[PDB]
Structure formats: C-alpha cells, structure tokens
Design a protein around this nucleic acid. Structure first.
Length: 185
RNA sequence: AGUCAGCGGCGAGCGAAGAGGGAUUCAACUCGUUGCCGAAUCGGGUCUUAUAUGACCUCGAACUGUGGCACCAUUUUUGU
RNA sequence: CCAAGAGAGUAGCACUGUUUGGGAAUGCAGUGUCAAGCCGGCAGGUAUUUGUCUGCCAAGGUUAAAUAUAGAGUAGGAAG
RNA sequence: GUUGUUCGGUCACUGAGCACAACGUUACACCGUUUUGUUAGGAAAGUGAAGGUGGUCGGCGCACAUCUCCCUUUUUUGGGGUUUGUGUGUUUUACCGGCUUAUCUGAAAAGGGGCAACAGAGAACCUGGGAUGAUAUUCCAAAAAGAAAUUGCAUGUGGG
RNA sequence: UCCCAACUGCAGACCGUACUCAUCACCGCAUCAGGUCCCCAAGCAUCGAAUGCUCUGGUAACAUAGAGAAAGGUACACUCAGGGAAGUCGGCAAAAUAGAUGCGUAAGUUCGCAAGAAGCAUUGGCUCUGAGGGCAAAGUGGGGGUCCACAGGAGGGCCAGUG
RNA sequence: UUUUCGCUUCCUUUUUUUGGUUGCGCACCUACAAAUUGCCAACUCAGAACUGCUUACGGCGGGGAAUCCAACUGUAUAAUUAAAACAUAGGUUUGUGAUGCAUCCAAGUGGUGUAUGUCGCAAACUGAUUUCUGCCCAGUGCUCUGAAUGUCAACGUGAGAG
RNA sequence: CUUCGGGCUGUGCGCCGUCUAGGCUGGGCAUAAUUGUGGUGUUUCUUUCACCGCCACGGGAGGGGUGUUGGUUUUUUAUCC
RNA sequence: GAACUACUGCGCCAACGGGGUGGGAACUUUUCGUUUCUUCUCCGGAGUCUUGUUUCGAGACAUCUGCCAGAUGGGGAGUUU
RNA sequence: UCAUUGCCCAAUCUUUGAACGCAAACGGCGCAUGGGAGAAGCUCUCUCGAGCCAUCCCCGUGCAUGCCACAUUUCUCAGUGUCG
RNA sequence: UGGAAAUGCGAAACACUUGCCAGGUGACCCAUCCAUCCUCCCACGGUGAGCUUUCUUUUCACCAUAAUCCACAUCUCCGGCCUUGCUGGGGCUUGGGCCUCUCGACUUCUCGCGUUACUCGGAGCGGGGGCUCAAGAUUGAAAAAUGCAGCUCACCCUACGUACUGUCCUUUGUUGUGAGUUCGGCGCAUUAAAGCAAAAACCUGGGGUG
RNA sequence: GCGCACAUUCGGCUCUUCGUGAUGUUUUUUUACAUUCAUUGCGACGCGCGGCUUCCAGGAAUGAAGGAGGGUAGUUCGGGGGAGAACGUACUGGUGCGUCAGAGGUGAAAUUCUUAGACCGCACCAAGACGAACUACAGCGAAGGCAUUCUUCAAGGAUACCUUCCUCAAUCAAGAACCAAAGUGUGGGGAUCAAAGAUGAUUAGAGACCAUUGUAGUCCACACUGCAAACCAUGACACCCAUGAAUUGGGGAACAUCAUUGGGUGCCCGUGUGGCGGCCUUUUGUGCCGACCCUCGGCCCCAAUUUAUUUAUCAAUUUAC
C-alpha cells in the first residue's frame, strides 16, 4: 500500500476512512471538503471554520450543521448563519465539510436520575451535583446567611462587577418569564 | 545639639549639618575630546634568552592598541 | 607666535510614587519630557523672574591607613 | 540464622504525573514558568573505492577414470585423441557471495529530557527429598533427587 | 558463497529472601474490645459463607483469681396472677409479628404499584403409593449343537517319550 | 413414464446423440408397529394411608386508620442533631459565538472552561410527577444599542515681566 | 562640478530593453491519402452500432499423447479416443 | 488529468527517463560513423521564474505598546460603630 | 628507638556531598577509553605442560551543565548578511 | 516450493523502506446465563490401615509434577514385502466443496435470533482453538510418593537397615474457559505504551561483465 | 335462389406454384432473368393428393349477467388529496437615503410620534405571511374541507366500450375510521391580527360597546381531541311522478365524411433507360434542359360517401358543417 489516512471529527454516517478528495477539487459528497464560499448558498455544511486553519470551530457540537446565507462575492466575504441567532460573517474563504452532525443531540431525551447525571458529566473535571448560592457559606459566598432562604439584592448586576461580586444574572436586560420575544419584531 | 536648624494628628512624636578639638594619615589615582604614528608602536600564541628581551608567526588588534599630552598645566602669554 | 583637545535620553523639567529632619521638595525609582551661545555648566536651604555678586566644574574610571564585627564567626592570648 | 542462569523486585513500558533548553521574578545559594519549548538539539538503506574471507564461475594447470574416434604388428600387448565422468592445483581470471576496514550518499514531532506501577502492561523450573535447630519453586552433585527451562557464548560436525 | 536449520560444548549479573503481619510482633501514647488492604475456606441441617454444632485445623484461648451464695447493682437473664398503657410528654421499653405452603388480600394509584395490603387455612412422626428421567438393541423367524468355529485354555506330565 | 437421475444391452432416427428397451444403481418408509422390550436411574414435588400430640432446636415482618412534612434512591455536620436540610431528576431566566465569553494569574507568548464551539459553555435561581403560576417596574437595582450638549479628570488650547 | 571646452549631474518625460506566466479556442499550414469523419459492414432511418479505411505490429499450433495389442505402424521403433 | 460516488461501498506509492561529457562494448570497412554498453556528468517531470514576506488574518486602529488620568468598585482592605 | 607522646611538613581519604556520564526509595543503569582476570578456543603438538588468545567478568579514569579562550599559521559547517 | 479449495511443509531462506499492516500482536467494563474444564464433595467398588464387648459393613486412608510426542489399530494390506497412504477422537469454531432449500421452509437454540438463493440446510470436506485423549507414550516411578508389615546384626541398636508386601476404580454435587463491548447497563460505551506476528518489499542464491 | 359454358367477367394475389441452390434463355428489356419460363436439384408452402401412421380430443359437457353487484380496459375531468419547488404581492419590521412642522388617531378626541427627528417619498433589504379582483346559485371534496405555477406523487369520480366476472348485494348494533373552531401536551414559530392584560375615553355606572394598543393565542412542525345554528336545522337506500323555461358543470356520441371514392389539358423543375426536340461527352448510349407529348402520380379544383332503419315500395327517420 502507502496513502493518506482519512478519519477525524465525526459528521454523518459514511463509514470511515473514506477517499474524499478535497478543497474545491472535492466533488461535493456529504462531508466532502470544499471551501464554503465555493459551496453554494443555502447549502448545509458542517463544521465550518472561522479562523480558517481550524478545521471546524463552529458547529463543533452535536447535532448541527450550519447554513450559508450569503456570499459577498465582491470581497469574498460570506455570511453564514451560526445556529444560534447569530450570523457570523467570515470570509467566504474557509474550509468546510459537507453536511451535518451525524449526532443530533441527546438534549431531547429525558435524562431521569442522578446516577445518570453522574455518568453524564464525567469526562472533564467534576462539576455536578450542584448546590445553590443561598446557603453557601457567607464567607466565601454572596448568598449564604439571611436567617432563611432568599435572595438579598437584585441579581441584576452591571457586567463590570468584581469577582466575588459577580455571579448569577449578569446585567440582565430582561429576565424571568419571556413575556415577549428577543431581537427583531 | 537632642539644639535658636528643624520636622511633626505640628500632637504624639521626631530632629540634623557646618565649623572646633581630635584620632588616623608623608594618599592619592586613568581615561575618553590635542600629531600619536616611514607595514600597530599591540597582544595572544610560538619560540629565544634562564624573562624581559630576542625572535617569529598567530592573528586579537588601525572601528585603534601603544606612546604623548590630560584645563593644577605645558610659560598663559608673548622670547617661535 | 598657536593651541589651548574635561563624561547626555544624562543632566534638566513635568508627572507620579516613594523617600527625607531638608522645609513652595533630601534623595530615588518609574513614566513622559528632556539641556550647554558654550558672555558656560553646577552650587549658594522661601516659590519666581530678573540681575549681579559668592563657591565649585558633576554626569565614565581606580584609590592604604585610622573603623567595624553587633551575637551564629576561626587561629592564638589576657581576664573578670 | 534467610543460599536462586529461572521467583520476586525490577533489564524497559506506558497513567494520571514530574526536565532541560528556553521564557518569566528586586531576585540562580528563596526562583517563577514552561513540561518539549522562538533551538540549527540525531543516525541510516544504498552506493562506491579499498582491503580482507568464502563460493561460484570462468578460465587455467595437474592427475585418475571414460561411451566413442584416429595410429603400429600375424594378432593381443602399446599410444594418442575424443567426448564424457572423477579428483587435485595455495594456478589464473572473470563473476558471485560475504566481511571488515574505507568513501559518498542518507530522518521529523503530545513529543528536541528523563523518571513515574513492591498488583496494569509484565518475557526461562517442575515435582520430590531416611530433606534444617532456625531457610529454601535458592539447600540436594556425579550416578538415585531427578527431570526441566532459558541465555550468552563458544566449538566440531552435521545440514553446508 | 559457507551460517537461510541441527546438534553439541562451554559459562550465567544485580538487587530481595528469617520471622511477624495483628484480641501482643502493624497502628492506635499502650502487650488497646478501636482501626487497618489481599489469597484460601469443610460436614451436616438448611433458603443458605445465615443461624447452629461440628470436621479438618487451631484453640485448649487467655483476658489476676479464689472463696463464696447476702444487700445494691449490673447481665445481649428470666418468669409472672389477673389485668391490659389506666401508665407515660411520649408505648421508650419491652413484649405481641414470623418460615414456608396453600388459600386469601380494601382503599388509592402517576397504572407501574400499593401488597407479606388485609385476612384465612395448612405444617409431626410413621407406613405404603403416585407423578415426574436417562441408558441400550427397528426387528424378526427358520436350520445347527447326533459340536456345528479357528489361533484361547485345563486335565491327561510312571512312558522305553519328545522339545 | 412430452423433464437435465445415471449407465449397460437392444430397437428406432444418420446416430455408437436423443427417444424407446434391458439390467443395475440415483431420488422416493412406498421398509413404515410398538418402539414392545432391556437396562439403569433420580430426589423433587405430590398423593395416600398408618400413627400420636407437641407456642417447644434454629433461625422467624405487628397491623390498621389518618393529619403535617419531604417526590423518590442518593447526601451529611468526625465526636449531641440525619431531618421537614442539602443533593436530585424535573421547573425558569441571564450571560455568552473566540482579536470571545467565562474564568484563573507576581509576571510571562501564564492558567482553566475547552485536546473545546449553542443539541455549546458559562452563570444562577426553582426543586419528582401533576397543576397553576395574579397584580406592581413608583421604589431599589439591572438594563438600554438610549437619548444627546447639564455634568463629569487628566488632557489639551490660547491668553500677563515672569 | 566645471576657462569657452572638457567633467559630472539632476529633473521631467520618452525610449528600446532581461526576466515569469506556455492548457484552451480560433486562425494558417504541414497533412498526400483519408478527409485521424473517408469508405465498407450494421439498427427503423444518414447517424447509431460494428468495422474498415489509410497505416503498423506479432501469431495461426498439428501433431502430440498406449514398449504392438488387433486394425492402422514401414516397424520390437509409432499410433490405436 | 481522481466519479458516479447518479447516493452510500477501501487494494496507486521506497529502489524510476532523456540529454551532454569522459571509457568501453556491440556494430559498422571504418577511423569518420551507426549501435550498445560502461564510467561520469547534466537536466526534466499542464512551469519556469523570483528585488521583495512562511501562510493567512489583521493593520498604523484594535493591540489596553506602556504610562498617566478619571469614573466605577464591599470583591477585598482597614478601622470605627 | 618508647610513646594511641609531641609536633608536623608527608601522605592516604571509602561512601557521599553543591555533586556533575545517566540515574535513583535501585549500591540501578549507562556511554568513551585504558587496564586486569579467566570455561572455550587456539596455538604451541612442548606429553603432561605451557603459552597465547578469544565468550565472560571486574577495576581505573574520561564523559554533567553553563561560561571563558583557543585551535595549523586553522577545525568542520551554515546562512536569500554579503563580493565581484 | 503441496491440495479446486478450506488449506501444505527441516529449511518453500530474503533483512532497510513502507502519510505499512481498523495487524485481539499489548487492549481491557461489567454483563448474562449456560455450557463445560479445573478443583471440589458424595458414593460404588475394591485395597490397605485403624475402629468397633449386649448390635452393625465404622473411620480414615487409598496418590502422580512440571516437562515433551502422539506412529496403535482400523484402513492401506492384519505383517510374502507390506510398500497407496500413513485414513481414523470427542466436542465447540469457522471455512470449504457438492447438491441448491422457493408450494417457503429449514433452523439452531434456555435466554432474548436467526437463517436462507447475499446460499440455507444437508451432506461431504478444510481448518480454528477451551478441552479432553488416544493404544496414552515419555515423564514415571525407580528408595516415586504413601502405608504396612516380615524379619533382621539388632530391634531398646545400628545403620535406622534389610527384606517384603499392598498401594485401585467407576460413579454423584462446586469452579477456569468458552474472547469481545458474549445476553444487560449505556444521554455511561469500558487505559496506554513498550511489547509481537505478518505483509507489502524484494534488492540474493539458480548468470559469461567489460 | 341455385347451378352454370370461361378466369380469356368485376375480382383474388403468389390459388397466374412458392422459396432457395443456381445454371439457362434474356443482351437501348420489366438489368441478373430463381418461382412462372427453359434447364434441373433440395426444401416447399399454398392447394391437392397420397400414405396414413400414431397419438390425442367434447357440443352447452359448467342456466340466463339485473336500468344487482364487482371489477376490469379507454381518452379525460375537477380549488380531491399529498409531497415539491417558483412567486406574485402586501403587511411589516428594517434599512438606505430625501426631506421636514408636523405627524397620528378620533364620536368628541383622547391616550400616540415629533424636529436626536415623527410622518412622508423613493430605493432596497430583511422577515414572516398571504395567494388578493380574477371567480361564480360556479367546480371538486365522505364529511370536516378544498383556489399562482410548475414539479411531482400516489388517489378519486364521471363519461366510453360487445371487457370480464354471476349475485356478488342492502342497510346496518357492537366494533372501527374520519370530524371546523378552539382548546390541550411536545416543538417550531414572531409578522400580523389580536383572547389576557394595559391604556384612553365614556359613562349614571362601566375594567363595556367605541377608541389606543397590546399579552396568550393565531400560522406551522408535532401531537391529541372531541365538544362545533359542523345547515340540503330535512337517515339511508328505493321507483315514480310538472313544465322546464331558460342556462348551466364533465364526458361521450351527430354535424351526409376530418379518412375514403369519383371526375379534369386547371396546374405541377412530379414520376417513368417511353417517344420527340434541345444541350453535354470517346461512347444514338449515358448525363443535363424543355409549360415537350405521352403512361401514371401530385397539388389544386370540382363532385359524392350514398352506404344507412321501422315499416313493402313506399313514406320518412340528420339544422349546418
């Protein structure tokens, strides 16, 4: 033999190791890697870069894909739409692998029990169960004390806030029940 | 002189020098800006000489080491 | 027949701080700023301009001896 | 009074984890940091000359053996040659094969340093012993202890 | 080419090694009921590392002891008549609960339970019985034992035998 | 038994092909009972008798009916307190898309979230399911991309012997 | 700068002027032919399709396979399907 | 110069040519010359070239270059109450 | 020629150690070089024997790091710095 | 270097290199039962010891290590000469070959399923490898080991002799391994490396340069 | 009506042997010359016969098809459905400017917006929506419900037939499968309309009408639901009945032939080795031209399509293409 490998980051289900021949001299199989600009608007790509030379920062989580919503062929900029209500305009330049996360979030699933949560979080540093601010010793914490279960002051802070003075609900322009909608009306 | 120096909630509290007497001392010293220049006057090495010196390379060194001179002088200056 | 060959982002100044008994600043450090016709430069303890007058000539460069030893110093005495 | 070519440990491995170069500190004799990094961070296959061994071949010299062919004599005895077979020469050379001097070519990163496992990973012994006072899968040697296993390295012969 | 095998000859470092490893060798200040990881684990009953006695082993344990049968205690000691929580802050305490089996089981419920819900019933010994599996050759007849088949055996080994 | 079971003999067609024929074999228990029987075997449960008298070893869950409270299992104050506490799934909002956010740090090309990217992370609040979650934004915060000319430091800027 | 002259120059512009980038489409042309789309073979339609063209290159086994044994062998040689 | 992949579907890689020089071979009468081989050497691989940068990105602003200046600041400080 | 006398010049000085070949709860383990010793082999056939020499082991000493000078009168390189 | 094949061998020699080897070569959870090995108990026999008084079949004991082959006979062919050949276990894996399952079926299961024309199944073959065995051989019995006992100089020595014996077999009930991440778990998916085999490679040996 | 003289009657088409081996004859001819023809062979079909030989078989064996049922087959019809895509265009929100002293809303105004700058105009975007008048006692759909396009997908109906099929049915408890709005859970979803609410205003009161907005909803993905003056307040199925007057919606079938037949100096670069003339060239030939003429064709024109049924002929049975 003697080739070049072909496995890395996971999007949808080809079965592995596959001969994708790339750049724009990629054809356009799903997962295939073509420049996003040279991928046609409205197409669904996955893991687009952003930095360029990053192999997929964006949408680097499970489920998505992202949609190109624009080319600016004059500059060679492109406006792509982050899954989030959020557009990012990157150069049209950028690599991308055709498609979607084969994955599609477990988020839907109802989680069920503690144990599950235990196995769940584990790959990283430990971070859960989670107790709350209101008893967490005053000496280290803002929300301890009070001769019973409550909030002191508004949880709505200026962003700038000291650490130790800054936790919770940063500068919430609004909070609580979303009685309306955010962004455009 | 804990002072007429004086700092200082000017408070607390702080706070010195000069001189004199005196000890000790015959204590004093270079370079960089001056013509320094008949194959760097040098240095390292080498080799002589019993060391310098001699000598020769090396090649550190003319991007400057030597020597001379160093705002007290040189006589300022003029006796060129 | 004349020369006349003396230290710079340093000095200084602002600014900040720190620091000083040192006072409208004793220093230092940072930062910025940033000097010499050389009728010069520095100093002359109330800010200044302004002028004299008075003392030096910094910002590179070396230097016994008289002193210390203060707590844990080491060789060799003398003691109370 | 605790005996090991074999058991362990741990000759090396990786885990989490911890150099040095660098880069940070008023600050190496209090370091901080980094944890393989502003680093030029190490040697081949192959060739090739060379030398040296071994083979082959090829050539060459010697000898033995040889279907067959040519020669004297009445005929056998006798000779040569052939071709073939065999053996030999430190033959010669060509050619291999080897091997070393020797000469040229000739490697890139979570890895440019090295540790980190008395349980992972984890490389050779079994049973028996009229066997010790107290040790032994270690002590028991050749024969009745024996029988093993492995390494290293020789040696000849064998395969060659 | 000779090492692309064989066999054989010849030699094996280093470092550990006893014993203890715990109701005395560890660690509880301490010859401590506290603690302290690992291997092994019979017979019988039986649900069965249970409970229990036990084998094998080990203990023969030791843990000052004797002497004693009073008060008080303490004891993982009991028992109590009738009575049945009056007691008591309080059913704490203690006591009532059982195996299994069969039978049987209310509300409610998120449908899943609730449930040993509740509640019944049964449980010896003896002496027969039943049900409940595996393991061969379908399967057969006739003829021969007035022998029918051989390699196998015994006894005949005082006959002047033979090997 | 008008097909690809096979071959032999023979006949027929040209045939020593096929086809027919024959012998044998190939597929087809259509050989087929019962499986009789032989053997050995097991302690389970069950059954029944016989029998008589025992809360007896051992080991053996009290129950019911409601109120408050917490969903639950989980968690824990060494050494008073184990719960109505926390954790907890479940509920809800912010903040936030990398020259970032969050966040650690003496400092550095330092750190971590993140060997990662909104099905993401971060941040807090609420505390199973179920069901609902009113009114107030004046206050006090927060927020604002809001406004724009009040204010707000240095900072400059021009003005007297100095 | 430079005695007129030599010397040098600048500036402005203009200048030739090294040097890369070397598929594809059109053009011209060798290409003879042929026209590597020409001519044949072939579908129902020219075409297609198959070929050929024009032009090259390399092959065509044939006998071999039974110690005879008949036949066939010329045969103790050989065939004998 | 990568194809159905048009819907999924694995096997390309180290050891490579031509030129030009030097020697020889082979062949040529044949030196000349053909041919080959050897030795050597050079060069080539839809470029080559290269004053000008690794590439991107960014950009004379963000970078807070760093330093002041101010606001803000129980996060902490310290003290007092 | 006493003296574990005295003095002292003369020397030794493990194992360590800043501690440095590497390393490290290991007398671990290396790396260059020298040196030693020796079953086997070999050889000498010396008969024995002896020697010689190998596999094998040991010891000595280098070998850490930085910085500093230097090299035959040059040590070897590198570089789009740079010469025509 | 063998056999259509599954798959073969004293040596078919062939080492660097491989943007080389989804290469169990290290490598991996638990998990499941089940299957069986192992071991283990029971018990039968049978021995040997020891027990055992009104009664008995009582008690105990009765063994075999690593390390290595797998050649005995069937059959060849029962041994003339035995010559094809060396054919020949179980019982899990897979494969391979023939036939080609279809009117659907088979099909294997304790388990959740599966399969088949994507070739079942069935046969026959090849091999994988727990295991077990196989003439079981070696090992190995031999002072084996164990238990006895008879004698013995002497037996109260001794040396602990010396000599002798016996020293066994079916058979019931526990557990390695069955290889995965092998039954479930699973918003969970079960270290790594050194460490090894293999391949590709194929340069050598089967060659006269010039 | 039947047979009949000849195929030399209109006429069939190989039943004027066929096919092929081929030869021959042909030789400015329909080349060559298969069958015919001449030579002859094999096959030979037609048709006949002949030999049969062998084997083998229904007619209607299996009523009769509902103005019963069921299909089937044929164009096609419809806002039927379902998946697509494309858009028109607006509402907005937004942008981007332009400007500008007013906007805006209203019973009355009032709450709104205002010179950052409101509106406004135009450009343009973004967004989500909606298919506007068309388009109507008009279509389709079980019902609910259903309107750009294309792209589809699979569906339905009707109509058509001499298609097959033999009651196939009917209607129907239980029982299933549907059911607008809205709600309801899980997710979109954001624009608007607007329940909740909030504001005005109003009122006597008024949180009501009315205004001004504005939260849930709304659309949708996705579920689920069953309640809707869910009205042809009218169960289904059946067989009938006025006039239909007009007019309708889909389809079929009529429109004296769209295809056919007949007729022509009307025409024709028509055909055709015919003849002729004209013209080329070694080759009267061939090749080229002739509104040359001829056989035939074409176009064009013209004519006709009768044929056709009850009932005698006969009447008459069709409006026009």
């Amino acid at each position: 033999y003697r080739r070049v490998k072909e496995l890395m980051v996971a999007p949808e289900g080809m079965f592995t190791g596959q001969s994708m021949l790339c750049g724009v001299k990629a054809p356009l199989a799903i997962g295939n890697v073509l420049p996003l600009g040279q991928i046609t608007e409205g197409c669904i790509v996955c893991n687009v870069e952003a930095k360029v030379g990053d192999r997929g920062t964006l949408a680097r989580a499970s489920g998505d894909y992202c949609i190109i919503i624009s080319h600016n062929t004059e500059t060679g900029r492109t406006r792509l739409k982050l899954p989030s209500g959020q557009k990012k305009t990157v150069p049209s330049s950028c690599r991308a692998m055709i498609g979607i996360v084969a994955g599609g979030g477990r988020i839907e699933k109802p989680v069920l029990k503690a144990g599950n949560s235990f196995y769940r979080f584990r790959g990283k540093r430990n971070c859960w169960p989670k107790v709350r601010g209101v008893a967490r010793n005053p000496v280290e914490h803002p929300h301890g004390g009070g001769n019973h279960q409550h909030i002191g002051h508004p949880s709505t802070v200026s962003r700038h806030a000291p650490p130790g003075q800054k936790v919770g609900l940063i500068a919430a322009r609004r909070t609580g029940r979303i009685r309306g909608s955010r962004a455009v009306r």
